[PDB]
Each structure stands twice: as structure tokens, then as C-alpha cells.
Amino acid sequence: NNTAFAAVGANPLEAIYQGAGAADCEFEEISYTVYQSYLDQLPVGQNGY
Amino acid sequence: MALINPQFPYAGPVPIPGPAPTETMPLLNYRVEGRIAGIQQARQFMPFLQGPHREVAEQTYYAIGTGIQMGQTFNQPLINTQEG
Secondary structure, three states: OOOOEEOOOOOOOOOOEEOOOOOOOOOOOOOOOOOOOOOOOOOOEOOEO | OOOOOOOOOOOOOOOOOOOOHHHHOOOOOOOOOOOOOOOOOOOOOOOOOOOOOOOOOOOOOOOOOOOOOOOOOOOOOOOOOOOO
């Protein structure tokens, strides 16, 4: 809640929203999901993969 | 290589006043014994290093291992019953 809302005049570099009403802005939930992308069934030859 | 004038010749040099003969003779200057003074130190804290340097940097490596290799659950093909 400190780095995502910037007041009028402050540096909006890492911010998300910026405005006059940014002192009272709150997050509620920041649910996330991670997906791994890989290659399966590696071609085992002699002495392993 | 001058040519002798026969009408007005001249003779050799005549004596003239002289420059007080001992005052053209120098003394032989008399050196005393000398010494490079002090006890010299053996080494000096030099402002530059005395060894070679390298113009370019080369990337170095070290070997690593992988891990214990496991088995797998392959998706297995269908049977060649004359459709394939």
C-alpha cells in the first residue's frame, strides 16, 4: 500500500495509480497464480538423459 | 695560403707585452676522498607494481554436477496392427 499509490507530485515510477485521493487507497486481495512451462519425457539414451 | 706581396712584404712577429706568465698557468686542483653517505635501505615501497598485467579478461569456468537422474512416465504408442 506504500509503493503502489503515489500522490500528486511524487515519482510515479513503481506506482500503479496516481492522484489526489491516493493517500486513502488500499489493496484488498492480490491473489496470484504461477504456471510452469517445461518439456516432458526427455530422451534417455545411454548414460542417462 | 696567402700570397706574398713583393712590393710591401712584412717580417715575422716581434715581441709584445705579455700577460704575466704565471697567471696563465693553473693549479692542479687537489681532490679529497669522498663517500656516498648513509646506510642504504634494501627495498623501496614502490608506487607501481613490478609485474605484468593482462590486456583482456578471459572467462573462467568450474565444473558442476547435475543430480540423481530419475525415471519417467512416457506416453506410450499404439500397437502396429497394420494401422501406422
